[PDB]
Design a protein around this nucleic acid. Structure first.
Length: 201
DNA sequence: AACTGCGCAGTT
DNA sequence: AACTGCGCAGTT
């Protein structure tokens, strides 16, 4: 199958693919966590992440976007620490990891990060799909740093620039590779009838 | 001075 | 709940 600490693209899953649920995304091996937004080890790096909404500063510009770390409680109580996934995402960036933040002198060498976009990010991003989840290729960490929210507590911000050959599925060439490849929304088996039987009664 | 086990806890 | 890092703890 596909090792869990596997960085990079999943063979058999092209960009522009769309599963209706997160469970399907995990099943596919593109983002294992059934609910969490990022997957990775403190000692290895981040393998994948999905976009929901959260922070209001998080700008999604398509080819690049910024992300916010997690933790700070157990509701903001303590300023986030560079441990766990916060740290793991920090490794994908190609520079010696540092407490005050860091910017890669050459971001392209950093470890790849599979990025999926959920439709819950529609309000904010004009790139999030209408419904479900869509795989938009590889993004590498360019730089990360720590800000201080309106809650006076530091939070870890990151900037991801795309870097996958295959064209963004929201562009002309993208929407083309899709058709050629015939990619369509995917529902779990038995889901559509289950959904049907809901509406009835 | 440490091996080790029951245990609170943050992260996902 | 599962899994981890490991105080504080009673055992070696």
């Amino acid at each position: 199958h596909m090792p869990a600490n596997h960085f990079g693209p999943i063979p058999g899953v092209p960009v522009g693919t769309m599963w209706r649920f997160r469970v399907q995304v995990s099943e596919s091996g593109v983002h294992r966590p059934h609910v969490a937004g990022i997957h990775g080890r403190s000692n290895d790096g981040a393998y994948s992440l999905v976009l929901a909404g959260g922070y209001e500063d998080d700008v999604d510009n398509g080819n690049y976007f910024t992300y916010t770390g997690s933790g700070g409680r157990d509701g903001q109580s303590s300023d986030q620490k560079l441990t766990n996934n916060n740290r793991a995402l920090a490794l994908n960036c190609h520079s010696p990891i540092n407490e005050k933040g860091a910017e890669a002198e050459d971001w392209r060498q950093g470890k790849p990060v599979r990025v999926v976009r959920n439709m819950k990010g529609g309000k904010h991003s004009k790139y999030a799909p209408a419904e479900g989840n869509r795989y938009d290729g590889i993004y590498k960490v360019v730089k990360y740093w720590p800000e201080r929210g309106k809650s006076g507590f530091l939070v870890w911000r990151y900037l991801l620039r795309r870097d996958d050959t295959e064209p963004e599925p929201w562009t002309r060439e993208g929407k083309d590779r899709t058709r050629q490849l015939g990619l369509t929304m995917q529902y779990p088996e038995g889901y559509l009838e289950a959904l049907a039987n809901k509406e009835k009664s």
